[PDB]
């Protein structure tokens, strides 16, 4: 028992982290096979970071300008190319520590582990969710660019995020491993609206099921609701509307606790309308939305 | 910017995890050099787990009874010994992945990362604190025994905890790497009082400094206090008394924000006496005590 914001073991990803230096900028790169993936803003200076012409800036660069170091060993760059907002630096040596991997684009509301890195060196690992508005509420300082987000299924690492930018609001923006930004963000130092965020309803419900599994039951009530009535409450409190697909993904947790998804929705409705009343659920005094139904089953069953 | 419950990258520890099977019990072991460390209750059955005579139970065991597997390879056991509540199984091969390491006994209120494991395989990593009452509020299922807690200083892994037991209250108990239990706990399936817990005051203050560094400032007030007045409030709210050593450890955070430790104590006093008033600090609606002053500086400066 016990419920924690658990991240995947970072070992497989630590073995892929390299340092990428171009001109005066240093950031992190991801070494998979004979390719190093890093944010394309590694080629920028402070002057052109307000409105960079990436094509023009990359034309002034040759393979020898991209200094790539894996710990204390220098990788030899034999090709470079820009794909969307990422640079792919072909190296003459395949990473001996390349795990089984995939590049995936996650959906908003899905979760992933982030291995924060500086100068190609891992500093820490944390779990987070891709917000409905495509930002991440991470913990990143200058030099963290190129740190990646991922999920692990047995031995396969699914890379879903590469960190690029911190918005003036303090939230984080980045791309998939093909360099496509999540959200409307551009790699420019400019005002960028993150857009209205919402609470991931399906995840809060999944977390309520984890709370019941782990003994926290005070919030369970004698009521039930319908998807329509619950969605009126979700509307009022800036929660994502709940669909039948969400109810279906909550099937296993509903079967495990024997608490019908709509009865759990009525518990969430009462919590939204009345608050916690100074109480806690799984050590939190607010409704937690960074655990998916899959995360809850994974943690509550012990998949390795 | 951004503040997360960050765990150390688990790579160095993942490389040490093995599976240990004795009779019908399987749990995790830690392979460092030519020694495998695991909880001594691996030699128990369900019948003798109520009051085990470990010396007697271990006498019925030979080296060949301890099945140790590292992934898919079998380690050959050439010696076994009990030290307090841990078994040390000498193996004929040193772990090629042994990192630079130390065995340390942490103080209550200190933090550490836990790599939860099942059948010698890493499932996840999370950060937690050793409670003032020597329990840990972890996330562990059956088979997690032998999962270890650690801190990392550059390349040196300091192992501080080995998981042994879940109390009937759902909290966790374990030992240092010499097999000494933290707290009054014994490796017996019996009623065990965890003792009155308290909130780690120095850590809450450190977290309040992290909140100021990361933009959350609403809680700052026009007041100050003394250690005596603050300790009267800490007494009333079951917070650990604040000492000059704690004030001294908060020195760097006090210097960084320019907010005197006693002025921050007055902010904490107002929060304790009035609550959050439905507001949040670093995404939490309660006062967080799982970040030490060192953790806050580490995360806010980016040490790798
Ligand atoms: C795309 C892009 C882009 C645009 C301008 C500038 C940059 C650089 C940049 O935003 N890097 C950082 C990322 N994370 C956290 C940080 C915290 C403090 C300072 C910098 C941070 C990227
Ligand atoms: C010392 C000791 C001792 C005494 C009796 C029994 C055991 C076994 C034991 O407590 N293992 C577990 C540890 N963590 C979480 C668990 C969750 C569900 C079931 C078992 C769990 C150890």
JSON list of C-alpha atoms in Angstrom, two decimals, chain A residues 1-12 14 115-119 121-129 136-141 166 169-172 280 283-286 290 298-304, chain B residues 1-12 14 115-119 121-129 136-141 166 169-172 280 283-286 290 298-304:
[
{"chain": "A", "resi": 1, "resn": "UNK", "atom": "CA", "xyz": [0.00, 0.00, 0.00]},
{"chain": "A", "resi": 2, "resn": "UNK", "atom": "CA", "xyz": [0.92, 3.69, -0.32]},
{"chain": "A", "resi": 3, "resn": "UNK", "atom": "CA", "xyz": [0.61, 5.97, -3.32]},
{"chain": "A", "resi": 4, "resn": "UNK", "atom": "CA", "xyz": [3.45, 8.01, -4.71]},
{"chain": "A", "resi": 5, "resn": "UNK", "atom": "CA", "xyz": [4.16, 10.24, -7.73]},
{"chain": "A", "resi": 6, "resn": "UNK", "atom": "CA", "xyz": [6.37, 7.57, -9.19]},
{"chain": "A", "resi": 7, "resn": "UNK", "atom": "CA", "xyz": [8.59, 8.07, -12.17]},
{"chain": "A", "resi": 8, "resn": "UNK", "atom": "CA", "xyz": [9.99, 5.27, -14.37]},
{"chain": "A", "resi": 9, "resn": "UNK", "atom": "CA", "xyz": [13.52, 4.09, -13.48]},
{"chain": "A", "resi": 10, "resn": "UNK", "atom": "CA", "xyz": [15.74, 6.47, -15.52]},
{"chain": "A", "resi": 11, "resn": "UNK", "atom": "CA", "xyz": [18.66, 4.10, -16.24]},
{"chain": "A", "resi": 12, "resn": "UNK", "atom": "CA", "xyz": [17.90, 3.42, -19.90]},
{"chain": "A", "resi": 14, "resn": "UNK", "atom": "CA", "xyz": [20.67, 8.22, -18.55]},
{"chain": "A", "resi": 115, "resn": "UNK", "atom": "CA", "xyz": [15.05, 13.16, -16.62]},
{"chain": "A", "resi": 116, "resn": "UNK", "atom": "CA", "xyz": [16.24, 16.71, -15.97]},
{"chain": "A", "resi": 117, "resn": "UNK", "atom": "CA", "xyz": [19.79, 17.14, -17.29]},
{"chain": "A", "resi": 118, "resn": "UNK", "atom": "CA", "xyz": [22.50, 19.83, -17.34]},
{"chain": "A", "resi": 119, "resn": "UNK", "atom": "CA", "xyz": [25.65, 19.62, -19.52]},
{"chain": "A", "resi": 121, "resn": "UNK", "atom": "CA", "xyz": [24.50, 14.92, -16.95]},
{"chain": "A", "resi": 122, "resn": "UNK", "atom": "CA", "xyz": [21.38, 13.62, -15.21]},
{"chain": "A", "resi": 123, "resn": "UNK", "atom": "CA", "xyz": [20.35, 15.64, -12.15]},
{"chain": "A", "resi": 124, "resn": "UNK", "atom": "CA", "xyz": [16.95, 14.17, -11.27]},
{"chain": "A", "resi": 125, "resn": "UNK", "atom": "CA", "xyz": [13.80, 12.39, -12.33]},
{"chain": "A", "resi": 126, "resn": "UNK", "atom": "CA", "xyz": [10.16, 13.32, -11.81]},
{"chain": "A", "resi": 127, "resn": "UNK", "atom": "CA", "xyz": [6.75, 12.34, -13.09]},
{"chain": "A", "resi": 128, "resn": "UNK", "atom": "CA", "xyz": [4.43, 14.87, -14.72]},
{"chain": "A", "resi": 129, "resn": "UNK", "atom": "CA", "xyz": [1.41, 15.18, -17.05]},
{"chain": "A", "resi": 136, "resn": "UNK", "atom": "CA", "xyz": [4.15, 20.84, -18.65]},
{"chain": "A", "resi": 137, "resn": "UNK", "atom": "CA", "xyz": [4.57, 22.09, -15.10]},
{"chain": "A", "resi": 138, "resn": "UNK", "atom": "CA", "xyz": [8.15, 20.88, -14.80]},
{"chain": "A", "resi": 139, "resn": "UNK", "atom": "CA", "xyz": [11.26, 21.91, -12.93]},
{"chain": "A", "resi": 140, "resn": "UNK", "atom": "CA", "xyz": [13.83, 23.15, -15.37]},
{"chain": "A", "resi": 141, "resn": "UNK", "atom": "CA", "xyz": [16.65, 25.73, -15.14]},
{"chain": "A", "resi": 166, "resn": "UNK", "atom": "CA", "xyz": [10.16, 28.09, -20.37]},
{"chain": "A", "resi": 169, "resn": "UNK", "atom": "CA", "xyz": [4.50, 32.23, -16.87]},
{"chain": "A", "resi": 170, "resn": "UNK", "atom": "CA", "xyz": [7.04, 29.68, -15.56]},
{"chain": "A", "resi": 171, "resn": "UNK", "atom": "CA", "xyz": [5.47, 26.71, -17.37]},
{"chain": "A", "resi": 172, "resn": "UNK", "atom": "CA", "xyz": [7.34, 24.53, -19.85]},
{"chain": "A", "resi": 280, "resn": "UNK", "atom": "CA", "xyz": [-6.61, 14.98, 2.82]},
{"chain": "A", "resi": 283, "resn": "UNK", "atom": "CA", "xyz": [-1.48, 12.99, 1.49]},
{"chain": "A", "resi": 284, "resn": "UNK", "atom": "CA", "xyz": [-2.83, 15.72, -0.80]},
{"chain": "A", "resi": 285, "resn": "UNK", "atom": "CA", "xyz": [-5.22, 18.55, 0.16]},
{"chain": "A", "resi": 286, "resn": "UNK", "atom": "CA", "xyz": [-6.27, 19.15, -3.48]},
{"chain": "A", "resi": 290, "resn": "UNK", "atom": "CA", "xyz": [-1.27, 13.60, -12.63]},
{"chain": "A", "resi": 298, "resn": "UNK", "atom": "CA", "xyz": [0.57, -0.10, -12.65]},
{"chain": "A", "resi": 299, "resn": "UNK", "atom": "CA", "xyz": [1.50, 1.24, -9.22]},
{"chain": "A", "resi": 300, "resn": "UNK", "atom": "CA", "xyz": [-1.23, -0.73, -7.38]},
{"chain": "A", "resi": 301, "resn": "UNK", "atom": "CA", "xyz": [-0.16, -4.05, -9.10]},
{"chain": "A", "resi": 302, "resn": "UNK", "atom": "CA", "xyz": [3.66, -3.60, -9.28]},
{"chain": "A", "resi": 303, "resn": "UNK", "atom": "CA", "xyz": [4.48, -3.99, -13.00]},
{"chain": "A", "resi": 304, "resn": "UNK", "atom": "CA", "xyz": [8.29, -3.84, -13.54]},
{"chain": "B", "resi": 1, "resn": "UNK", "atom": "CA", "xyz": [11.77, 27.68, -12.50]},
{"chain": "B", "resi": 2, "resn": "UNK", "atom": "CA", "xyz": [9.27, 25.10, -11.22]},
{"chain": "B", "resi": 3, "resn": "UNK", "atom": "CA", "xyz": [9.50, 22.87, -8.17]},
{"chain": "B", "resi": 4, "resn": "UNK", "atom": "CA", "xyz": [9.08, 19.13, -8.26]},
{"chain": "B", "resi": 5, "resn": "UNK", "atom": "CA", "xyz": [9.44, 16.16, -5.89]},
{"chain": "B", "resi": 6, "resn": "UNK", "atom": "CA", "xyz": [12.56, 15.08, -7.69]},
{"chain": "B", "resi": 7, "resn": "UNK", "atom": "CA", "xyz": [14.30, 11.81, -7.13]},
{"chain": "B", "resi": 8, "resn": "UNK", "atom": "CA", "xyz": [17.95, 11.07, -8.01]},
{"chain": "B", "resi": 9, "resn": "UNK", "atom": "CA", "xyz": [18.50, 9.38, -11.40]},
{"chain": "B", "resi": 10, "resn": "UNK", "atom": "CA", "xyz": [18.21, 5.65, -10.55]},
{"chain": "B", "resi": 11, "resn": "UNK", "atom": "CA", "xyz": [20.67, 4.25, -13.11]},
{"chain": "B", "resi": 12, "resn": "UNK", "atom": "CA", "xyz": [23.53, 3.46, -10.74]},
{"chain": "B", "resi": 14, "resn": "UNK", "atom": "CA", "xyz": [19.24, -0.28, -11.15]},
{"chain": "B", "resi": 115, "resn": "UNK", "atom": "CA", "xyz": [13.85, 2.51, -6.36]},
{"chain": "B", "resi": 116, "resn": "UNK", "atom": "CA", "xyz": [10.84, 0.22, -5.90]},
{"chain": "B", "resi": 117, "resn": "UNK", "atom": "CA", "xyz": [11.64, -3.25, -7.23]},
{"chain": "B", "resi": 118, "resn": "UNK", "atom": "CA", "xyz": [9.85, -6.58, -7.75]},
{"chain": "B", "resi": 119, "resn": "UNK", "atom": "CA", "xyz": [11.66, -9.86, -8.60]},
{"chain": "B", "resi": 121, "resn": "UNK", "atom": "CA", "xyz": [13.42, -5.58, -11.54]},
{"chain": "B", "resi": 122, "resn": "UNK", "atom": "CA", "xyz": [13.03, -1.83, -11.14]},
{"chain": "B", "resi": 123, "resn": "UNK", "atom": "CA", "xyz": [9.44, -0.60, -11.37]},
{"chain": "B", "resi": 124, "resn": "UNK", "atom": "CA", "xyz": [9.72, 3.06, -10.34]},
{"chain": "B", "resi": 125, "resn": "UNK", "atom": "CA", "xyz": [11.53, 5.78, -8.47]},
{"chain": "B", "resi": 126, "resn": "UNK", "atom": "CA", "xyz": [10.23, 8.32, -5.96]},
{"chain": "B", "resi": 127, "resn": "UNK", "atom": "CA", "xyz": [11.56, 10.75, -3.41]},
{"chain": "B", "resi": 128, "resn": "UNK", "atom": "CA", "xyz": [10.56, 10.56, 0.25]},
{"chain": "B", "resi": 129, "resn": "UNK", "atom": "CA", "xyz": [11.63, 11.60, 3.77]},
{"chain": "B", "resi": 136, "resn": "UNK", "atom": "CA", "xyz": [8.62, 6.13, 5.54]},
{"chain": "B", "resi": 137, "resn": "UNK", "atom": "CA", "xyz": [5.39, 6.86, 3.71]},
{"chain": "B", "resi": 138, "resn": "UNK", "atom": "CA", "xyz": [6.35, 4.88, 0.62]},
{"chain": "B", "resi": 139, "resn": "UNK", "atom": "CA", "xyz": [4.59, 2.91, -2.06]},
{"chain": "B", "resi": 140, "resn": "UNK", "atom": "CA", "xyz": [5.43, -0.73, -1.72]},
{"chain": "B", "resi": 141, "resn": "UNK", "atom": "CA", "xyz": [3.55, -3.96, -2.51]},
{"chain": "B", "resi": 166, "resn": "UNK", "atom": "CA", "xyz": [4.74, -2.60, 5.96]},
{"chain": "B", "resi": 169, "resn": "UNK", "atom": "CA", "xyz": [-1.08, 1.30, 9.47]},
{"chain": "B", "resi": 170, "resn": "UNK", "atom": "CA", "xyz": [0.15, 1.21, 5.85]},
{"chain": "B", "resi": 171, "resn": "UNK", "atom": "CA", "xyz": [3.46, 2.95, 6.60]},
{"chain": "B", "resi": 172, "resn": "UNK", "atom": "CA", "xyz": [6.86, 1.44, 5.86]},
{"chain": "B", "resi": 280, "resn": "UNK", "atom": "CA", "xyz": [-1.82, 26.86, -2.98]},
{"chain": "B", "resi": 283, "resn": "UNK", "atom": "CA", "xyz": [0.92, 23.34, -6.45]},
{"chain": "B", "resi": 284, "resn": "UNK", "atom": "CA", "xyz": [0.27, 22.01, -2.94]},
{"chain": "B", "resi": 285, "resn": "UNK", "atom": "CA", "xyz": [-2.66, 22.91, -0.65]},
{"chain": "B", "resi": 286, "resn": "UNK", "atom": "CA", "xyz": [-0.80, 21.74, 2.50]},
{"chain": "B", "resi": 290, "resn": "UNK", "atom": "CA", "xyz": [9.73, 16.40, 2.15]},
{"chain": "B", "resi": 298, "resn": "UNK", "atom": "CA", "xyz": [20.18, 21.49, -5.34]},
{"chain": "B", "resi": 299, "resn": "UNK", "atom": "CA", "xyz": [16.99, 21.73, -7.40]},
{"chain": "B", "resi": 300, "resn": "UNK", "atom": "CA", "xyz": [17.06, 25.56, -7.61]},
{"chain": "B", "resi": 301, "resn": "UNK", "atom": "CA", "xyz": [20.77, 25.53, -8.81]},
{"chain": "B", "resi": 302, "resn": "UNK", "atom": "CA", "xyz": [20.82, 22.36, -11.00]},
{"chain": "B", "resi": 303, "resn": "UNK", "atom": "CA", "xyz": [23.62, 20.22, -9.48]},
{"chain": "B", "resi": 304, "resn": "UNK", "atom": "CA", "xyz": [24.13, 17.04, -11.58]}
]
